[PDB]
Design a protein around this ligand. Structure first.
Ligand SMILES: Nc1nc2c(ncn2[C@@H]2O[C@H](COP(=O)(O)OP(=O)(O)OP(=O)(O)O)[C@@H](O)[C@H]2O)c(=O)[nH]1
Ligand SMILES: [Mg+2]
Ligand SMILES: [Zn+2]
Ligand SMILES: [Zn+2]
Ligand SMILES: [Zn+2]
Lengths: 85, 114, 133, 559, 159, 141, 168, 196, 263, 43, 49, 65
DNA sequence: CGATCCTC
RNA sequence: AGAGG
């Protein structure tokens, strides 16, 4: 409880701009604080640019707890969420 | 208060070199020379002359921002013609034209009375 | 490629519609009883008066970066006096057998009417206009 | 109100703003001194360490430098005084408060902050001189001019805070307004005026300039286009080199009034594969229009691509115009000898029309229709006849203006001014009003002591026959001043009033947000809308498009 | 008045019509008058509409009016914005004001209401009525100095 | 000598004023088209005349060239503005010890003056300079 | 006719024409089946809401009622063929482009519409000039406008200034 | 500012060479834009210029007095007597390129005023700094190195953008912030925390 | 002789009116620019104020002194103090002028450029002597003193170009016109009725043949023949303004030729 | 200065408005913007 | 060029700003609005100069 | 304050010209227009420089200190 | 009982 | 309270 199951989840399969921006921020923070990089940083040194690469490569190990107005939620991994924008 | 020194218009700084010759990214046999501590006096003069050269495919200058006294010159030449050469040729032509002018004006001046 | 059209036209009207270097020309074929022509001409470069006989040719040769003429031995497909370069943009069929072509020579427009604009005038960035005498 | 909702903040700056045709849309020119004050806490990583030691070396007075080194515990080493300021042996995990450098995200704002667009993330570009420099095409969302306006600048202190700006508040993102589902930034002033001037059929340019214009575009392919004219002199049209600034795959169609497809008046618009085929480029195309080039370039290519577009358009048009030149003088308000005689004639017949209606009114003849006073009707008539006069006189002037007339030129481009300005400046100023009615009898039965009692004539009750060129008479002058005053008075009212309306509206809706079920709900979780805007669509992603099944005849539908 | 009404051919036509304009409102009584279109009848007094035809018509009229001001100026604001405002006043059963009387009297958290007007007294009745603030509102977080449940923090991030 | 009289707004109510000594009252029976239109002095029962219609203005407006050729509010703005301008405020400026004193290095008398400026001592103590100005689209700066 | 909707279809068509270098003097490769069933299928894919249930399914159906009218009015057989002169390759991409753009056009949970709406009405409010009467020419149509009316509206002013019945 | 409600700041300085020039070699001191003319509707500005040009040339003061019979025609007439084009226009040359300009510039003398509130008296920037005694918030005014107000109106813009963490940092990290001890029972700041 | 051709119409100590035929726009223009800026001259660059009891401010006076024109004849024989090996200034790189004035007379005492006095060793160079063209032989009126009023100052005059400060300008105004008939159609005359009637005919029109009504537009034509008038302040003589103008341009082009060689 | 010594202040049925009666008495142009617009007069 | 007309108080130059008021002993009549039971009202703000 | 050395717009030394100008009017009974021309002040930028100049220094020297 | 932003 | 948008 409360947790909605993985099957039967009506929220967008797509990641919101707000999700993306927060994910990019949280990751850029970790990168900038000497935490490990999960992708080949070929030529890059910018913590945001690195988080962006990590996102594009879907090697970002973070999950979004989507709250609904009743209090229930839906957990979606950065790996699963479609990144159109 | 935030205004830079007027000598910065004509005086080269530390690390600063006059010409910075870079190979053009897109076009073949084209080059891009950044002229430091120079303006329209030199830009428009070299550019106009480079055009008189039949083996010059393209020649155009620009001063990206007024605050800074520097200009960019892009030159393209025919196969086997190095632009650095088309530049030195253009430069030498200017010198010669100027020589004659100096001489001719000087001659004329010596003929006048007042 | 080679020519795609050639005909001698007769100037109906010449209009400087609030323009002082450009003029819209109204022309008709000396041979064809239906073949029309409406064209914008730089009347400062090629002054055109009334009922002047004009050879109008549409070609596709003499993408690649422009090199200045600056070669005497360079010979272009003209002994002509006025040459333009444009793009095809519309092909309105003016009912039954009559077809019109739309060319824009850098915003100087052209409209040529007829029948035989067939396997010659296609939707092409290729378009050379050539005027004679 | 002022200590919790709002508060005075650290890492902020302010100064006079100035225009910059050489800065990118999304940039902001920051004075070296200001850059030298505001810092960002950067953590030492091996990725940065070399830049960071050199920055600590430059110290607090040479620009790309720093002000403080923070380490273990959290102690601040002050680089401006510390004896080891030139010693400093950096360690990872340590922080270096570095000078705000080029390309950092910053929040740039103009007060009052009535829009989400009054607040925008900008790319820093450190510059000499004391003003905040900005791209002219960002003027409008800010409602800025350079007459002395000052702007505020805030610096993010966190890696996650910089992302919020660069990923949500960024200027290119802001291009298409959700407010009016259309873009909120376009080609304004010189560039707008010049783009029209450059795009005419008559406007032809040559090799020397063409080559410079081409090199001026940064995204330039490096391929000289074939001149529209190959004959005596290779000559490029204005339309041509400007299509170099327009990216490929850009298709735009308009059809103004006369517009055929053979566009006789050079009106309307046709751009195919990002090459202008016909039609003069002005406000309708290049402004902040709904079906404009900007809305298209943003939607098609992207915000960052469109933001770059403003730059290229400006660079070309500006350079072209800088060399072409454009002015405006007293001669531009002067209209024909015969035109003047005809404007005078127009006012004279209105003068008669009014006098006849007056003579009629005084004979107890005119019968006012149901609902209004015999006198109420009289004034509608007079005031109508008198507006007709001004408007007709003005249209007479506008018509007499040449295509070389610098005022007509600006109006045509849509860069500055309207008809009314031509009308008031050259033909006739017009009837002045206070509280809806024409100038009232402040003096007993007269408007001024220079008149007789009970005088209802155009002149007596504030009708300005003269244009600003002609000059106003003292009566006209004073009457105009009375009308003028009303403007200034309500301007004061309206701006004070609307500001309160805004705070109320904001406070009343603040907490309404779209939830993860598309439901528009408040803080209490109450439903306001079941789908946002009845469709669950974002306002920026919406445009006017014709529903082809609704109109026309049944026969026309059938066909 | 001019009207766009479809012709027998199908195409819409400018068929002009006679319309009466009044000074003063008695909607209740004028719609029961013969020779009129009770379907079409209108008043700028959206509050009368509210009372005579119900809250939904009230909303419709309230929008029709708000829109009218925006378009009067010559400007345009996307439907949804005005639709949102109009709906806010509406969803309540009656018309809630955009002043300290209307929305500032509502069931909302004590700290977001003291942010607007009547600051001190809103907090005084909060202590008297023994109010409990949820702290999910914008203003509450703004006062508390915490990450508000706004866009960026409207969801939680986990590993 | 009773050739002039002092009139208040109350007495103003009972009188008839001509705007010009000339143009408002000589005789009646070609024209200059460039000149402004002036309504025919149909009322001829004058008790007074205006010393000069320009006298309707006060200090700040009296500094403006051709206010009669300007849109009503631009005249209001310039009035407030000229009070934010620099120059010789007094001759003894460097004998006084006042907070904030801004004096123009080389102030010059405007090439275009009003007749009212004679009394306002403007040419004696000026606020600007006669700049050579061009109305032009140049660098777009 | 013209109403603000997401997905500028006109452009997609124009784009497909240029991308696939559309030959207006050639017979296409589609079937009545391809077009008719294609649009019918595209309709099902235009998602706003995602609930498996009937309440949310109707909510979805309602939300796209208008957009589908456009979609169908624009992409009907006759038009797709004689007007657009599209090909199966070109047409399929149009269907993917519409779906994509539509999905992008959707609102993001977190979008603070409260502030947005308020500011979106509030900023244009400040831009209002000489507001007494501008909706008048005679004297009969002289009703309170601009900021004073907007104030009456927002205050839900019991005592109006220009109460008016318009009787049809 | 000119004597016509035409205030504006310097945008840039150009030295004599870079300026456009008359064939006499006259050059501007100032370059005002044609766009700030049609809307503002300040015709006297244009008349002033014409009047002043005739005044400088003839060496006679310009009568700019209001209710006069001085006509633009009369002035225009005199300027031509001085061999310049009647309406104040002048053929001008680009200082960079040397080429003529397709436009003839309306150029002559105009009385311009220097106004107080110059850039450097306004330029202000603040990193960390002095905090108020009661509020514990950054001080006011540049004189004491004060913090610029990030008001509620600005707060609203940030809410609109949905930048929750920025808005949090702007009201905490930057400006205010404080650590208080509270009771898990009464919830009031009673806790007499004897740290260390 | 070969390329560019000069024809002096008029010449005096202060002005040179000449035609410059067989030249391109860029050269004519680049020469006008180099005359304005780039030619070095000598001007007051540092003022030590020992005494000032005048109504004028120290820096207001210091400013004017900078603007006084000084003999810049032998200016290439003087070093830029930045290239000089001294500590600050010397005689190889600077000229020291002195000014001492006291209102001895009851009548207002005038302080002229004539009143400046060299204290530097000029080592026989025509340098630093204030340029005096005033018939009364006073030169510039620097200052006015009453009775008690004293002014005691020392100024170091240094080498420089106008491109740094407009005081180092040897020229002032260069008249410049090409094609007085607009045959080139390089401009577009604004008009009410007739361009020819409304625009005054140029003084150089008699130096060129009119376009001949019914003649086609010469598209191929390029501008070559520039009617110029170089004026001088007097620091350097007119002949030098143009000669040194040419020379400086040569020098700066020659440095580019040379910069390609170090590369 | 002269302007400041000729200022009028009006404290508190349309005082802001330029009344007919002001002719020749108070300056029609001179008045501050917003705040005391039409309340602060000049003779 | 000084015009006087100001005061010098503790070295500071003070201007007494002319203050606008309605003249007393003046008989003005006012039509009173729709809710009041009095149609019109005749006032005199009497004083002793 | 006192006759500017050199014209702002053009640079032509106007410094030496003032005493000469006043004298030209006072003694030679000339008018400003001829007086400016007689001193070689041809361009209007040079003309405004002397014509428009107000010499405040004369009033300033009148103060004893 | 509230009445736009900024500083001094 | 003085002024700046
Ligand atoms: N949108 C728009 N506004 C214009 C245009 N022309 C003038 N304005 C506005 O007209 C008004 C007058 O110009 P300003 O005198 O500079 O107004 P201001 O800078 O706010 O100074 P104040 O008069 O004290 O309010 C301002 O609101 C300008 O933005 C135009 O073409 N478009
Ligand atoms: Mg402003
Ligand atoms: Zn407790
Ligand atoms: Zn030395
Ligand atoms: Zn000069």
């Amino acid at each position: 409880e409360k947790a909605i199951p993985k099957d039967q989840r009506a929220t967008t399969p797509y990641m919101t701009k707000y999700e993306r921006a927060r994910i990019l921020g949280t990751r850029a923070l970790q990168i900038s604080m000497n935490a490990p990089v999960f992708v080949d940083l070929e030529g890059e040194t910018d913590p945001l640019r690195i988080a962006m690469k990590e996102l594009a490569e879907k090697k970002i190990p973070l999950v979004i707890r989507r709250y609904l107005p009743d209090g229930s939620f839906e957990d979606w991994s950065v790996e699963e969420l479609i990144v159109d924008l | 208060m935030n205004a830079p020194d007027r000598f910065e218009l004509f005086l080269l700084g530390e690390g600063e070199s006059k010409l910075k010759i870079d190979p053009d990214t897109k076009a073949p046999n084209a080059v891009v020379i950044t002229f430091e501590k120079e303006d329209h006096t030199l830009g428009n003069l070299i550019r106009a002359e480079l055009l008189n050269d039949r083996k010059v495919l393209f020649a155009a200058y620009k001063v990206e921002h007024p605050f800074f006294a520097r200009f960019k010159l892009r030159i393209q030449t025919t196969e086997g013609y190095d632009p650095k050469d088309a530049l030195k040729n253009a430069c030498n032509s200017i010198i010669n034209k100027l020589g004659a002018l100096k001489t001719n004006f000087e001659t004329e001046w010596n003929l006048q009375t007042l | 490629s080679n020519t795609l059209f050639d005909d001698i036209f007769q100037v109906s009207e010449v209009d400087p519609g609030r323009y002082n270097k450009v003029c819209r020309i109204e022309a008709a074929s000396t041979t064809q009883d239906q073949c029309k022509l409406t064209l914008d001409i730089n009347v400062e470069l090629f002054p055109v008066a009334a009922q002047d006989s004009l050879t109008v040719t549409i070609a596709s040769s003499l993408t690649r970066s422009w090199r200045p003429p600056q070669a005497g031995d360079r010979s272009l497909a003209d002994d002509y006096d006025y040459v333009m370069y444009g793009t095809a943009y519309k092909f309105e069929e003016v009912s039954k057998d009559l077809i019109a072509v739309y060319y824009s020579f850098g915003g100087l427009l052209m409209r040529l009417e007829g029948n035989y604009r067939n396997l010659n005038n296609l939707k092409q960035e290729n378009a050379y206009l050539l005027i004679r005498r | 109100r002022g200590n919790l909702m709002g508060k005075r903040v650290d890492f902020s700056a302010r100064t006079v703003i100035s225009g910059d045709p050489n800065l990118e849309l999304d940039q902001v020119g920051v004075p070296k001194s200001i850059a030298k004050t505001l810092t960002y806490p950067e953590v030492v990583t091996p990725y940065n360490i070399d830049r960071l030691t050199q920055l600590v070396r430059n110290g607090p007075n040479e620009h790309p430098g720093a002000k403080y080194v923070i380490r273990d515990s959290g102690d601040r080493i002050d680089l401006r005084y510390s004896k080891r300021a030139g010693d400093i042996q950096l360690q990872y995990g340590w922080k270096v408060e570095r000078h705000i450098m080029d390309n950092d995200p910053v929040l740039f704002n103009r007060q009052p902050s009535l829009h989400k667009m009054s607040m925008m993330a900008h790319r820093v570009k450190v510059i000499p001189y004391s003003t905040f420099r900005l791209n002219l095409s960002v003027t409008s969302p800010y409602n800025a001019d350079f007459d002395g306006d000052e702007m505020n600048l805030h610096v993010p202190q966190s890696e996650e805070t910089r992302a919020e700006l660069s990923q949500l508040c960024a200027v290119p993102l802001q291009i298409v307004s959700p407010q009016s589902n259309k873009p909120c930034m376009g080609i304004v002033q010189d560039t707008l005026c010049g783009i029209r001037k450059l795009t005419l059929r008559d406007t032809f340019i040559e090799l020397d300039q063409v080559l410079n214009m081409l090199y001026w575009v940064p995204d330039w392919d490096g391929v000289i286009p074939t001149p529209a004219i190959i004959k005596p002199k290779p000559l490029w049209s204005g339309k041509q080199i400007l299509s170099v600034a327009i990216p490929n795959g850009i298709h735009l169609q308009r059809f103004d009034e006369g517009t055929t497809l053979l566009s006789p008046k050079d009106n309307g618009m046709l751009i195919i594969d990002g090459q202008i085929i016909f039609g003069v480029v002005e406000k309708k195309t290049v402004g902040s229009s709904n079906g404009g080039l900007i809305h298209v370039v943003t939607r098609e290519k992207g915000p960052q691509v469109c933001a770059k577009l403003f730059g290229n358009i400006q660079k070309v048009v500006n350079f072209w115009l800088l060399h072409n030149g454009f002015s405006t003088g007293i001669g531009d308000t002067i209209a024909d000898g015969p035109t003047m005689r005809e404007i005078t004639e127009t006012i004279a017949e209105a003068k008669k029309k009014v006098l006849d209606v007056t003579k009629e009114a005084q004979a107890n003849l005119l019968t006012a229709k149901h609902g209004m006073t015999l006198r109420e009707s009289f004034e509608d008539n007079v005031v109508r006849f008198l507006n007709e006069a001004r408007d007709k006189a003005g249209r007479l002037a506008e018509v007499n203006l040449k295509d070389l007339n610098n005022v007509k030129q600006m109006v045509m481009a849509g860069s500055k001014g309207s008809f009314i300005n031509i009308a008031q400046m050259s033909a006739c100023v017009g009837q002045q009003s206070v509280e809806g009615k024409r100038i009232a009898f402040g003096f007993v039965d007269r408007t001024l002591p220079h008149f007789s009692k009970d005088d209802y004539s155009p002149e007596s009750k504030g009708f300005v026959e003269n244009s600003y060129l002609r000059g106003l008479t003292p009566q006209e002058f004073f009457f105009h001043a009375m009308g003028g005053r009303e403007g200034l008075i309500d301007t004061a009212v309206k701006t004070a009033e609307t500001g309160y309306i805004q705070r109320r509206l904001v406070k009343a809706l603040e907490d309404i947000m779209v939830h993860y079920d598309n439901t528009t709900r408040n803080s209490l979780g109450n439903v306001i809308q079941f789908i946002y805007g009845e469709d669950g669509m974002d306002a920026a992603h919406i445009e006017k498009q014709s529903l082809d099944t609704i109109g026309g005849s049944d026969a026309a539908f059938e066909k | 008045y001019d009207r766009k009404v479809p012709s027998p051919t199908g195409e819409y036509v400018k068929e002009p019509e006679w319309v009466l304009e009044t000074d003063g409102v008695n909607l209740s009584e004028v719609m029961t008058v013969p020779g009129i279109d009770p379907t079409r009848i209108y008043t700028n007094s959206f509050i009368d509409i509210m009372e005579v035809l119900g809250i939904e018509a009230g909303r419709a009229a309230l929008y029709k009016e708000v829109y009218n001001v925006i378009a009067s100026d010559g400007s345009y604001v996307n439907y949804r914005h005005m639709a949102l405002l109009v709906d806010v006043m509406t969803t309540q059963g009656g018309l809630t004001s955009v002043t300290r009387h209307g929305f500032n009297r509502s069931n909302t958290g004590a700290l977001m209401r003291c942010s607007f007007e009547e600051t001190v007294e809103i907090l005084f009745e909060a202590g008297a009525s023994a109010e409990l603030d949820d702290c999910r509102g914008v203003s509450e977080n703004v006062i508390l100095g915490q990450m508000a449940p706004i866009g960026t923090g409207a969801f939680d991030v986990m590993i | 000598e009773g050739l002039v009289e002092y009139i208040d707004a109350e007495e103003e109510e009972s009188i008839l004023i001509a705007m010009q000594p000339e143009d408002l009252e000589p005789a009646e029976a070609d024209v200059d088209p460039a000149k402004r239109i002036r309504v025919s002095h149909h009322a001829t029962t004058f008790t007074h005349c205006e010393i000069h219609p320009s006298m309707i203005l006060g200090v700040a407006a009296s500094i403006i060239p051709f206010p009669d050729h300007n849109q009503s509010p631009r005249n209001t703005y310039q009035s407030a503005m000229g009070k934010q301008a620099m120059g010789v405020f007094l001759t003894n400026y460097n004998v006084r010890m006042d907070t904030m004193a801004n004096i123009l290095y080389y102030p010059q008398k405007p090439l275009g003056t009003t007749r009212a400026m004679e009394y306002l001592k403007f040419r004696e103590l000026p606020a600007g300079q006669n700049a050579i100005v061009a109305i032009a689209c140049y660098s777009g700066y | 006719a013209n109403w603000p909707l997401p997905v500028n279809i006109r452009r997609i068509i124009q784009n497909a024409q240029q991308t696939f270098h559309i030959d207006h003097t050639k017979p296409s490769d589609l079937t009545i089946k391809d077009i008719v069933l294609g649009v019918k299928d595209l309709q099902e894919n235009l998602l706003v809401l995602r609930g498996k249930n009937e309440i949310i399914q109707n909510a979805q159906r309602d939300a796209v009622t208008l957009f589908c009218c456009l979609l169908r009015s624009r992409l009907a057989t006759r038009r797709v063929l004689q007007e657009y002169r599209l090909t199966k390759q070109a047409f399929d991409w149009v269907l993917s482009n519409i779906e994509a753009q539509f999905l992008r056009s959707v609102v993001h949970p977190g979008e603070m519409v409260g502030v947005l709406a308020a500011q979106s009405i509030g900023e244009p409010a400040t831009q209002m000039t000489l507001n007494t009467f501008h909706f008048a020419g005679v004297a009969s149509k002289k009703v309170t406008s601009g900021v004073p009316r907007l104030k009456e509206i927002l205050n839900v002013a019991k005592n109006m200034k220009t109460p008016s019945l318009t009787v049809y | 500012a000119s004597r016509h409600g035409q205030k504006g700041t310097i945008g840039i300085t150009y030295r004599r060479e870079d300026m456009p020039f008359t064939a006499e070699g006259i050059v501007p001191d100032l370059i005002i834009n044609p766009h700030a003319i049609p809307s503002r509707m300040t015709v006297a500005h244009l008349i002033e210029c014409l009047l002043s040009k005739v005044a400088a040339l003839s060496g006679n003061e310009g009568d700019a007095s209001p209710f006069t019979d001085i006509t633009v025609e009369g002035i225009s007439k005199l300027l031509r007597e001085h061999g310049y084009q009647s309406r104040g226009f002048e053929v001008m040359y680009n200082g960079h390129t040397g080429k003529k300009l397709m436009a003839q510039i309306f150029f002559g003398p105009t009385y311009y005023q220097r106004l107080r509130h110059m850039v450097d008296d306004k330029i202000h920037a603040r990193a960390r700094g002095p905090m108020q005694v009661l509020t514990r918030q950054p001080v006011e005014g540049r004189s004491r190195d004060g913090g610029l107000r990030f008001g509620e109106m600005e707060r609203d813009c940030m809410i609109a953008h949905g930048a929750a963490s920025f808005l949090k940092e702007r009201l905490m990290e930057a400006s205010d912030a404080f650590r208080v001890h509270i009771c898990g029972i009464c919830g009031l700041m009673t806790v007499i925390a004897k740290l260390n | 002789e070969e390329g560019p051709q000069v024809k002096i119409r008029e010449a005096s100590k202060d002005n040179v009116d000449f035609i410059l035929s067989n030249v391109d726009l860029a050269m004519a223009n680049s020469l006008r620019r180099v005359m304005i800026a780039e030619i070095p001259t000598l001007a007051i660059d540092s003022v030590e104020v020992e005494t000032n009891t005048t109504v004028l401010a120290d820096e207001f006076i210091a400013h004017r002194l900078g603007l006084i024109p000084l003999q810049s004849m032998d200016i290439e024989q003087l070093e830029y103090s930045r290239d000089c090996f001294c500590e600050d200034h010397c005689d190889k790189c600077s000229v020291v002028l002195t000014l001492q004035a006291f209102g001895e007379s009851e009548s207002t005492t005038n302080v002229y450029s004539k009143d400046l006095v060299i204290v530097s060793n000029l080592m026989g160079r025509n340098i630093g002597h204030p340029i005096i063209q005033d018939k009364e032989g006073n030169g510039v009126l620097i200052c006015k003193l009453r009775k008690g009023q004293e002014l005691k100052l020392t100024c170091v005059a240094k080498k420089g170009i106008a491109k740094e400060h407009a005081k180092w300008g040897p020229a002032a105004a260069i008249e410049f016109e090409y094609d007085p008939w607009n045959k080139l159609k390089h401009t577009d005359y604004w008009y009410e009725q007739d361009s020819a009637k409304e625009w005054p005919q140029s003084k150089n029109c008699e130096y060129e043949d009119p376009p001949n009504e019914g003649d086609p537009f010469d598209y191929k034509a390029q501008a070559d023949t520039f009617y110029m008038n170089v004026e001088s302040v007097g620091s350097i003589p007119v002949d030098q303004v143009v000669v040194r103008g040419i020379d400086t341009l040569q020098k700066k082009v020659a440095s580019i030729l040379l910069a390609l060689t170090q590369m | 200065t002269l302007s400041h010594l000729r200022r009028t202040n009006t404290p508190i049925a349309k005082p802001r408005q330029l009344h007919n009666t002001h002719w020749g008495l108070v300056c029609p142009a001179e008045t501050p913007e917003g705040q005391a617009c039409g309340l602060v007069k000049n003779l | 060029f000084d015009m006087g007309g100001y005061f010098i108080i503790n070295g500071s130059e003070k201007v007494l700003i002319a203050q606008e008021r309605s003249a007393g002993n003046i008989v003005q009549v006012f039509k009173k609005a729709a809710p009041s039971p009095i149609s019109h009202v005749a006032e005199i703000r009497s004083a002793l100069e | 304050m006192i006759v500017p050395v050199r014209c702002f717009s053009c640079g032509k030394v106007v410094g030496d010209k003032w005493e000469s100008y006043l004298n030209l009017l006072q003694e030679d009974e000339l008018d400003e227009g001829t007086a400016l021309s007689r001193l070689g002040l041809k361009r209007y930028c040079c003309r405004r420089m002397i014509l428009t100049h107000v010499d405040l220094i004369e009033k300033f020297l009148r103060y004893n200190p």
